[PDB]
Amino acid sequence: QRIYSSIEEIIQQAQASEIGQKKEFYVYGNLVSIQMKNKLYYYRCTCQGKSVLKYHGDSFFCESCQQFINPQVHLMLRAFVQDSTGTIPVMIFDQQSSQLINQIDPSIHVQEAGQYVKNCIENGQEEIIRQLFSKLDFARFIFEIQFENKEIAYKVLKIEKE
Ligand SMILES: [Zn+2]
């Protein structure tokens, strides 16, 4: 059976941990404030590399597989997760970001969520995306969350709306 943990507890286990350490928890609560200040989307390679340089003339070079490639556009979101007991900043990556977008606008397939966001933002439709992110404000989910010493960074591994 699944055992949930309060944000309060997670934070204190985090404070009391060594550098390389990582732990996963199941959390219940809501999403607050998807952040629109930073770059929402990034170019990624099929080699699981985020390290992708954009060259002139529609070229992209992957630092990992060390070659020019044709990248995908992936969502990387930063938000706050909040239960009755606490609040934390988390990073949500493409599988889960895309899943959220798709869940508010099911016309947008997970596969294309990043591109959708990029095309809107870069062509004067940022508002349309702000709107989108707002409808998630205070929506409740069950998350699987992971922390790690580096600061303590928290990442969403999994999301389910219930
Ligand atoms: Zn690569």
From Swiss-Prot:
Similarity section: Belongs to the replication factor A protein 1 family.
Consequence when changing residue 78 to A: Reduced single-stranded telomeric DNA binding
Disruption phenotype: Critically short telomeres.
Effect ascribed to mutating residue 138 to A: Does not affect single-stranded telomeric DNA binding; abolished telomerase activity of the holoenzyme telomerase ribonucleoprotein complex
The protein, known as: Telomeric repeat-binding subunit 1
Start-end of C4-type zinc fingers: 45-65
Effect on the protein upon substituting residue 50 to A: Reduced single-stranded telomeric DNA binding
Assembly behavior: Component of the telomerase holoenzyme complex, composed of the catalytic core (the catalytic subunit TERT, the telomerase RNA template component TER and TAP65/p65), which is associated with two heterotrimeric subcomplexes: (i) the replication protein A (RPA)-related subcomplex, composed of TEB1, RPA2/TEB2 and RPA3/TEB3 and (ii) the CST-like subcomplex, composed of TAP75/p75, TAP45/p45 and TAP19/p19. TEB1 and the CST-like subcomplex are tethered to the catalytic core by TAP50/p50.
Binding site for Zn(2+): 45, 62, 65
Coiled coil (residue ranges): none
Subcellular location: Chromosome, Telomere
Intrachain disulfide bonds: none
Role of this protein: Single-stranded DNA (ssDNA)-binding protein that mediates the recruitment of telomerase to telomeric DNA. Telomerase is an essential ribonucleoprotein (RNP) enzyme that copies new telomeric repeats onto chromosome ends by repetitively synthesizing the short telomere-repeat sequence 5'-TTGGGG-3' using an RNA template component TER.
